[PDB]
Design an enzyme around this catalytic site. Structure first.
Site, mmCIF file in Angstrom:
data_model
loop_
_atom_site.group_PDB
_atom_site.id
_atom_site.type_symbol
_atom_site.label_atom_id
_atom_site.label_comp_id
_atom_site.label_asym_id
_atom_site.label_seq_id
_atom_site.Cartn_x
_atom_site.Cartn_y
_atom_site.Cartn_z
ATOM 1 N N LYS A 1 1.971 -6.243 -2.509
ATOM 2 C CA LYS A 1 1.689 -6.346 -1.086
ATOM 3 C C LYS A 1 0.668 -7.457 -0.842
ATOM 4 O O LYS A 1 -0.453 -7.418 -1.354
ATOM 5 C CB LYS A 1 1.195 -5.011 -0.518
ATOM 6 C CG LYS A 1 0.689 -5.103 0.917
ATOM 7 C CD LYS A 1 0.599 -3.736 1.583
ATOM 8 C CE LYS A 1 1.980 -3.225 1.969
ATOM 9 N NZ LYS A 1 1.933 -1.955 2.743
ATOM 10 N N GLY B 1 10.076 -7.358 2.515
ATOM 11 C CA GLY B 1 9.825 -7.183 3.932
ATOM 12 C C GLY B 1 8.572 -7.918 4.366
ATOM 13 O O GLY B 1 7.728 -8.259 3.539
ATOM 14 N N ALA B 2 8.457 -8.163 5.669
ATOM 15 C CA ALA B 2 7.302 -8.851 6.237
ATOM 16 C C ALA B 2 6.849 -8.152 7.512
ATOM 17 O O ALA B 2 7.659 -7.560 8.222
ATOM 18 C CB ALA B 2 7.640 -10.303 6.522
ATOM 19 N N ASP C 1 -1.976 7.125 8.162
ATOM 20 C CA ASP C 1 -0.699 6.587 8.625
ATOM 21 C C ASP C 1 0.501 7.236 7.933
ATOM 22 O O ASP C 1 1.320 6.560 7.307
ATOM 23 C CB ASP C 1 -0.663 5.063 8.471
ATOM 24 C CG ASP C 1 0.389 4.417 9.353
ATOM 25 O OD1 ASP C 1 0.819 5.061 10.333
ATOM 26 O OD2 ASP C 1 0.786 3.266 9.074
ATOM 27 N N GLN D 1 3.149 -7.469 10.493
ATOM 28 C CA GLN D 1 1.965 -7.946 11.200
ATOM 29 C C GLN D 1 0.776 -8.218 10.280
ATOM 30 O O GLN D 1 -0.003 -9.142 10.518
ATOM 31 C CB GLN D 1 1.568 -6.940 12.286
ATOM 32 C CG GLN D 1 0.298 -7.300 13.047
ATOM 33 C CD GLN D 1 -0.125 -6.225 14.031
ATOM 34 O OE1 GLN D 1 0.594 -5.248 14.249
ATOM 35 N NE2 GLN D 1 -1.299 -6.398 14.627
ATOM 36 N N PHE D 2 0.637 -7.420 9.227
ATOM 37 C CA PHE D 2 -0.540 -7.517 8.367
ATOM 38 C C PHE D 2 -0.249 -8.154 7.012
ATOM 39 O O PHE D 2 -1.150 -8.330 6.195
ATOM 40 C CB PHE D 2 -1.182 -6.142 8.186
ATOM 41 C CG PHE D 2 -1.444 -5.430 9.477
ATOM 42 C CD1 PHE D 2 -0.532 -4.516 9.976
ATOM 43 C CD2 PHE D 2 -2.597 -5.681 10.198
ATOM 44 C CE1 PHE D 2 -0.766 -3.861 11.167
ATOM 45 C CE2 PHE D 2 -2.839 -5.030 11.390
ATOM 46 C CZ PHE D 2 -1.921 -4.118 11.877
ATOM 47 N N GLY D 3 1.009 -8.503 6.776
ATOM 48 C CA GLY D 3 1.372 -9.177 5.546
ATOM 49 C C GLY D 3 2.801 -8.939 5.100
ATOM 50 O O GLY D 3 3.651 -8.538 5.893
ATOM 51 N N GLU D 4 3.058 -9.193 3.820
ATOM 52 C CA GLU D 4 4.401 -9.074 3.266
ATOM 53 C C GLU D 4 4.424 -8.175 2.030
ATOM 54 O O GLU D 4 3.384 -7.805 1.498
ATOM 55 C CB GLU D 4 4.945 -10.464 2.919
ATOM 56 C CG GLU D 4 4.947 -11.438 4.092
ATOM 57 C CD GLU D 4 5.379 -12.845 3.705
ATOM 58 O OE1 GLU D 4 5.346 -13.178 2.501
ATOM 59 O OE2 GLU D 4 5.754 -13.621 4.611
ATOM 60 N N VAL D 5 5.621 -7.809 1.591
ATOM 61 C CA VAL D 5 5.787 -7.096 0.333
ATOM 62 C C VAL D 5 6.852 -7.801 -0.498
ATOM 63 O O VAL D 5 7.934 -8.115 0.003
ATOM 64 C CB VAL D 5 6.182 -5.615 0.541
ATOM 65 C CG1 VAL D 5 6.370 -4.922 -0.805
ATOM 66 C CG2 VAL D 5 5.131 -4.890 1.361
HETATM 67 C C1 LIG Z 1 14.063 -1.837 7.173
HETATM 68 N N1 LIG Z 1 12.902 -2.263 6.406
HETATM 69 C C2 LIG Z 1 11.723 -1.406 6.322
HETATM 70 C C3 LIG Z 1 10.795 -1.933 5.227
HETATM 71 N N2 LIG Z 1 11.599 -2.482 4.141
HETATM 72 C C4 LIG Z 1 11.139 -2.266 2.774
HETATM 73 C C5 LIG Z 1 10.576 -0.850 2.661
HETATM 74 C C6 LIG Z 1 9.917 -0.666 1.296
HETATM 75 C C7 LIG Z 1 8.792 -1.690 1.171
HETATM 76 N N3 LIG Z 1 7.908 -1.475 -0.009
HETATM 77 C C8 LIG Z 1 6.584 -1.425 0.126
HETATM 78 C C9 LIG Z 1 5.996 -1.184 -1.093
HETATM 79 C C10 LIG Z 1 4.511 -1.128 -1.227
HETATM 80 C C11 LIG Z 1 3.878 -1.845 -2.228
HETATM 81 C C12 LIG Z 1 2.491 -1.825 -2.319
HETATM 82 C C13 LIG Z 1 1.736 -1.107 -1.399
HETATM 83 O O1 LIG Z 1 0.371 -1.119 -1.514
HETATM 84 C C14 LIG Z 1 -0.385 0.020 -1.460
HETATM 85 C C15 LIG Z 1 -0.105 1.101 -2.287
HETATM 86 C C16 LIG Z 1 -0.898 2.244 -2.224
HETATM 87 C C17 LIG Z 1 -1.974 2.302 -1.345
HETATM 88 C C18 LIG Z 1 -2.256 1.213 -0.527
HETATM 89 C C19 LIG Z 1 -1.466 0.073 -0.587
HETATM 90 C C20 LIG Z 1 2.367 -0.417 -0.371
HETATM 91 C C21 LIG Z 1 3.757 -0.437 -0.281
HETATM 92 C C22 LIG Z 1 7.033 -1.107 -2.021
HETATM 93 C C23 LIG Z 1 7.118 -0.880 -3.393
HETATM 94 N N4 LIG Z 1 6.008 -0.698 -4.140
HETATM 95 N N5 LIG Z 1 8.328 -0.839 -3.997
HETATM 96 C C24 LIG Z 1 9.448 -1.012 -3.282
HETATM 97 N N6 LIG Z 1 9.402 -1.222 -1.959
HETATM 98 C C25 LIG Z 1 8.218 -1.270 -1.300
HETATM 99 C C26 LIG Z 1 9.349 -3.106 1.230
HETATM 100 C C27 LIG Z 1 10.026 -3.294 2.581
HETATM 101 C C28 LIG Z 1 12.826 -3.252 4.276
HETATM 102 C C29 LIG Z 1 12.943 -3.561 5.760
#
Ligand SMILES: CN1CCN([C@H]2CC[C@H](n3cc(-c4ccc(Oc5ccccc5)cc4)c4c(N)ncnc43)CC2)CC1
Ligand SMILES: [Ca+2]
Ligand SMILES: [Cl-]
Length: 435
Positions: A211, A190-191, A302, A193-197
């Site tokens: 992230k 996903g992508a 959040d 405003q503040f970055g991507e994952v």
């Molecule tokens: C409809 N959408 C809504 C968002 N979408 C996905 C939703 C899950 C998202 N996603 C995000 C994460 C993720 C990864 C790191 C992160 O960093 C921090 C962790 C703790 C504290 C501070 C920062 C935060 C989050 C993620 C994941 N680890 N493992 C698997 N998926 C992950 C990746 C995008 C898909 C599109």
């Protein structure tokens, strides 16, 4: 001369770690945290091993039916996991009686369905064990063997130990800050405003999530400061931070959660088929994570379904904790934070109430039909989201307590967790008493 035995098979993936099989014995040379230095008695090789993959010879931890550090609620969850049956059981550390043990057993009744019962095991301070004072054993194995024959007071006869699972391999030793070249970001999840994952691979052996933060937005020495706190917030219900790339643009490396966000999962097909008691368990897991944050005097800022991640075995883990500090979405925000910018643990409680509504409505947006400024004009007047057709009164009552105009009148996460954990169990029914 300390000897340990391997509890699970393990395959080496680093420079100096040892491979071994379940049953392999080893000599401990150095105890240094998650990684221990040892010599394999089978191969005569010296190297590093994951400390939580091993235990001292003939200690309780070596028993297939013993589960260390497991709470009553976790035992319930594990016993009701797929692969288990009637009489599936476990001996575990007692939560409310330090130093003593408890028995948990899978049970069934037409009214409640598949259930888990719990029995206190009494140590005889001399001393064997017993659940019923009229039946005493020298060891726990003897107790287990006895109740394998027949229930003899128990809800069910003991059958087979609870199905277990390999613990996650610990992260590479001394690898908190890694070079960017160690990562291959393979698929963008996903992508924003503040970055991507991204889904990524670390040093060609470990699947992780990364992230990537757009340089901006925010400070890199304000992040690095906060990042050394976020690493100390280790808990089963918080997503685990493995590493960080310090050179801008900042990368944040964490465990990969196979089922994405809770929000996406609830809207999916597998999510649509989750019964109400399962949704409540999800809420309880999140409350447990938030109770840990509350206890460590931290804040989230959040809290919402979008920031909750789901593992393959349906474990909910809180993400993005302490990220809003170093950086939508007023429908999840407490009034004192919308109007005065006052973020506390009590504002998170407000957020939790909203999240609760997301869960029970399978991902429906808060205040459906209304608008951001339109919602704020409803909070002044004292409007609250009505109870949905599938939400129990007592569950809705928890939301209302979370949605108090006065932050001081909002309950703690410690309390919320305790209510949600035992939502279907009367206090007097937590343990079973046998004469
Ligand atoms: C409809 N959408 C809504 C968002 N979408 C996905 C939703 C899950 C998202 N996603 C995000 C994460 C993720 C990864 C790191 C992160 O960093 C921090 C962790 C703790 C504290 C501070 C920062 C935060 C989050 C993620 C994941 N680890 N493992 C698997 N998926 C992950 C990746 C995008 C898909 C599109
Ligand atoms: Ca009782
Ligand atoms: Cl030796």
């Amino acid at each position: 001369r300390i000897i340990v035995v391997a509890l699970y098979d393990y395959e080496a993936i680093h420079h100096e770690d040892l491979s071994f099989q379940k049953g392999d014995q080893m000599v401990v040379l150095e105890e240094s945290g998650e990684w221990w230095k040892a010599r394999s008695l089978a191969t005569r090789k010296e190297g590093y091993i994951p400390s939580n993959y091993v235990a001292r010879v003939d200690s309780l931890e070596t028993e297939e039916w013993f589960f260390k550090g497991i709470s009553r609620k976790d035992a319930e969850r594990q016993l009701l996991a797929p692969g288990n049956m009637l009489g599936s059981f476990m001996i575990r550390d007692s939560e409310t009686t330090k130093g003593s043990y408890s028995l948990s057993v899978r049970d069934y009744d037409p009214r409640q369905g598949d259930t888990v019962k719990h029995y206190k095991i009494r140590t005889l301070d001399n001393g064997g064990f017993y659940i019923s004072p009229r039946s005493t054993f020298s060891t726990l194995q003897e107790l287990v063997d006895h109740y394998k024959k027949g229930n003899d007071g128990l809800c069910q006869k003991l059958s087979v130990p609870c199905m277990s699972s390999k613990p996650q391999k610990p992260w590479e030793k001394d690898a908190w800050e890694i070079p960017r070249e160690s990562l291959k970001l393979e698929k963008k999840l996903g992508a924003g405003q503040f970055g991507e994952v991204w889904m990524a691979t670390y040093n060609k052996h470990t699947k992780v999530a990364v992230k990537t933060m757009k340089p901006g937005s925010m400070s890199v020495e304000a992040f690095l400061a906060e990042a050394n706190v976020m690493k100390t917030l280790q808990h089963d219900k918080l997503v685990k931070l493995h590493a960080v790339v310090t050179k801008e643009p900042i990368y944040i490396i964490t465990e990969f959660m196979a089922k994405g966000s809770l929000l996406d999962f609830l809207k999916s097909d597998e999510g649509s088929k989750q019964p109400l008691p399962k949704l409540i368990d999800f809420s309880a897991q999140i409350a447990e994570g938030m109770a840990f944050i509350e206890q460590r005097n931290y804040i989230h800022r959040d809290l919402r379904a979008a920031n909750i991640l789901v593992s393959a075995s349906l474990v909910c883990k809180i993400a993005d904790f302490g990220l809003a500090r170093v950086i939508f979405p007023i429908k999840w925000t407490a009034p004192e934070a919308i109007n005065f910018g006052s973020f506390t643990i009590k504002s998170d409680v407000w957020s939790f109430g909203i999240l609760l509504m997301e869960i029970v409505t399978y991902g429906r947006i808060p205040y459906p039909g209304m608008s951001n400024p339109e919602v704020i004009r409803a909070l002044e007047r004292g409007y609250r989201m009505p109870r949905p057709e599938n939400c129990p009164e007592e569950l809705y009552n928890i939301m209302m307590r979370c949605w108090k105009n006065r932050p001081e009148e909002r309950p703690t996460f410690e309390y919320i967790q305790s209510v949600l954990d035992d939502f279907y169990t009367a206090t007097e029914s937590q343990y079973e008493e046998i004469p």
